[PDB]
């Protein structure tokens, strides 16, 4: 991150963007009903565990996601393919954990939000919705 925080202006800009973003997230959560808050909590517990256990896997998978030929759009479609043939909870949790890791290492906020938004549609198929609502 220090490769982008070169000048005082970069620091201050970073500070303002963080604040704007943090405030938005806090106020969003403030507005969410109990049901949605429960789902966030469930996703947190399960994906924190997956990301921790398979931390080494997530890291090298990122290393090839950083190759020139990689595109989020093609990756999205490959995920959509996988979910259609396999209906286990694991692969969906694993996909969330990986996209989250891609997000942590993406310093382009706009690109990141786009990735999050697109993949969230893809990951949340009726199969996934069934699992989270059962665990509710």
């Amino acid at each position: 991150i220090l490769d982008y925080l070169s000048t005082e202006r970069d620091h201050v800009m970073m500070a303002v963007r963080y604040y704007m973003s943090k405030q938005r997230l806090d106020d969003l959560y403030r507005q969410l009903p109990t049901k949605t808050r429960s789902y966030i909590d469930i996703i947190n517990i399960y994906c924190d565990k997956v990301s921790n256990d398979y931390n080494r896997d997530m890291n090298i998978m990122y290393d090839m996601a950083s190759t020139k030929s990689f595109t989020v759009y093609d990756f999205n479609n490959e995920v959509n393919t996988i979910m259609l043939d396999n209906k286990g909870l694991g692969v969906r949790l694993a996909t969330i954990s990986f996209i989250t890791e891609l997000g942590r290492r993406c310093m382009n906020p706009v690109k990141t939000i786009k990735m999050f938004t697109l993949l969230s549609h893809t990951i949340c198929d009726d199969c996934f919705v069934d699992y989270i609502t059962d665990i509710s």
């Binding site: 997956v50 398979y54 896997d57 998978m61 090839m64 996601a65 190759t67 030929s69 990689f70 595109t71 093609d74 990756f75 490959e78 995920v79 393919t81 996988i82 396999n86 286990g88 909870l89 694991g90 692969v91 969906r92 949790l93 694993a94 996909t95 990986f98």
Partner: peptide, 21 residues
């Protein structure tokens, strides 16, 4: 090519998760 293989490894990780669970 890479996106095709990553998604395959996520499946493997997923099945692994499902079995230990």
């Amino acid at each position: 090519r890479p996106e095709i293989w990553i998604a395959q490894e996520l499946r493997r990780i997923g099945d692994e998760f499902n079995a230990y669970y």
